[PDB]
Each structure stands twice: as structure tokens, then as C-alpha cells.
Amino acid sequence: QSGRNVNHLVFANTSYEILGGGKKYNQVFMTMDGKLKIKIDYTVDDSVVEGDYFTVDFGKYIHPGTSRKPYRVNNIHDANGRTIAIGSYDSATNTAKYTFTNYVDIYNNVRGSFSLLSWPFKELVTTDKQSVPVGITVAGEDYTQNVIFNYGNRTVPVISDINYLTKDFAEFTTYINQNRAFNTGSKVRLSGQGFKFTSPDEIEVYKVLNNSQFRDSFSPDYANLTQVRNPKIIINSDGSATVDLGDIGTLGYIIRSKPNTLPDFSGIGVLKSEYTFTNNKNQRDTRAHASSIQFVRAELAGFGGFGGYVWFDAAAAGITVNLLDPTGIRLATTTTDITGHYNFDNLTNGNYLVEFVMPEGYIPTQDSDVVFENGRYIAHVTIKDADNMTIDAGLVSD
């Protein structure tokens, strides 16, 4: 522990705001920009010090973030962008921790606000128009409001949604023939922008026993659906996939697919289901549904790390290295080990300063260059998921 739990010294007032296509109707429209925004205004007792922390427990029904998992929380800042506290999230306890920086040692009368976007757990908020008691605990005080969620699961030939996204793939859910019309020669093409298929293994096919299984949240209980054992799936040359369901009659199907994120993709991704079928009067047609999702693959994990070496220009052991925000607030500290190496891991993607604390009478040798700025020797580093710059420092007598 860097400090103590100071929930009793952080005084927070909370409200919710519904965003997206259902705001006028007081509903979170999960497939129309719907999110639940949590807005927190707080004050902090002057006795709080660097390393102390407060918590936000998201309770039973929601998590911070939206589609990309694992979920994360951002740092919290003052009006000038100075970091007041570092945000971390623990998935097992669905709780965020906000750990105060040296901001609280530089300033008194610490106060601020911040907001979080949040989404429901789709396995608990399962049903369109479900009103759930969204109870959270903010710095040790409960706040609850009932919130209505709606996924717009229409009883139609084809509808699909993105269940979740990870750095490597999305899980895409396609519902076929919920209207239970008589259909023959049923084929489904799954296609994307920013995504591709490589193997039939990325696609699972399920026949529903009854309509109860078409869960509105598009996160079905697959453990209670038996896969079609040998589905007919072809991976096309364009990276799409075609599933031949055959003469399904009035049966309903769910297709659970895991299209891969494309390296280098940056933009508004799309996942689309096209369902081609023939009806009871021998008319063949194609219906389609598409869902959009903004992402940058290089930043999709949302965090990364970096390190480097310090030496006398002999490894320099036990040199203090601080991680600062661009305004000079201390976010973390470490020391070089016996080999002269240091590192910082699990850093939210963004820009940082790396401060090397000079031993008396030493200066660096000679972006990643260690320069004298605002009384400190610092390099600049930009953190993304992977391939971050190594940040080294050679030291010489002044």
C-alpha cells in the first residue's frame, strides 16, 4: 500500500446522466450511442497525502467503460490538467481506486470533478426496457438511481450487435429468423471493416430451442445452447465468412463470431451480418444489419509500459527515476536496479515526462533526449500498447 484508504476524507457528490439515442426517453439505448455517465464532484481534506487513495465501487450492474475489455479508468485532473489522482480498476471487485499524486502535498483546498462512462453487464441487464437499481459507492457513500436499458432487439430476420471488443478480436452476435418465418437456402455472410476472419474456428452456430434464448442484450447463455456440431462455414478471400444454414424452415439461429482486429487499423470499424434466404413463396432476398465501433488498434488495450538504463559515461544503481505528467506532477517513482535498469508498467496510454534525479555534480551526456526543463532533467515519452521508446540516460561529471 502506497498510503491509506481515505474514503472518509474525500467528500463526493454524485449524479448520473444518460447519453445517446434514448436520452429523450430516459433510457440508455445500448445500440445507439447509449452510455451511463457518472459525474462526481469532490473535496479532499488537507491531511490527505501522496499515495493515499479513495475508491469507487461500481456495484452489481455496471462497469466503467463501454465495449473494450478489460475495463480501465482514467486519471483525474484539476482545471489546468494537473493530475490529482491516478485511476486503476480491479475487475474482480468491480472497483476503481484513485491514488493521490503529490498534488495533495503541493496544494491545499484540493477540490475537483470528474466523470466516467459506464455500461451494464449484459449477462445481468438482459432484457429490453429492464430498469435496474444502479447502486454504486463513491468514496464510501452509496448512491443509487434506477436506470432503464434498451438494446432494441427486434423480432426480425437478421439483427446483430457487438457484445464486446478486446485488443485481438470482437465477439459479434448475430440473430437469425427471430420472426420464425419459413425460410430455405439460408446463408449468412459476416463481414467487417477493421476486422477479418481467418478460420471457421472463429465462428460458432447455435439453433435455439425457443425464442427465450434470443437474449435482448446480445450476450446469450451459450452454455445452455448446443453448438451445431459440424456447421458449414467458409472463410472468403476478402476476409469475410459465409455460414450456410441450409433449409432452416421456421427455426431460429444464433451465430457467435470472433472477427480479428486488423493491425494498423484506425477509424470507425464496422461489423455486418447479411442474411440471404428464400421464403414460402419462392422469393429470395437479402437483409442486412451493421454495427459501427470506433477504435485505434495500436491503442486498443489502453495501457503500456517502458523502461531503460542509466550508467556513468558502469551501471548507475539506485538512481531515482520519477514518472511525471506533462505538467510536472509526480505519478510514480522507482529506482534503477543493480544493472542500472528501471521500468514503469501498466501506464494508461498518453504523454509523460521521465525525470532522472542527478546525483550531486552529475549531468546527462550529450523526444527521448534527457533535457533540462523547469529545474529537472527529463525525457518525454508517449505510451501506447506496445513498442514504446526505451528511455536511457548516460551520466557525466559537470
Swiss-Prot record:
The gene is uafA. It is found in: Secreted, Cell wall. The chain holds residues 393 to 809 of 2316 of the full protein. It comes from Staphylococcus saprophyticus subsp. saprophyticus (strain ATCC 15305 / DSM 20229 / NCIMB 8711 / NCTC 7292 / S-41). Involved in adherence to the cells of the urinary tract. Shows hemagglutination with sheep erythrocytes as well as good adherence to human T24 bladder carcinoma cells when overexpressed in a strain with non-hemagglutination. This is Uro-adherence factor A. It comes from the Bacteria.
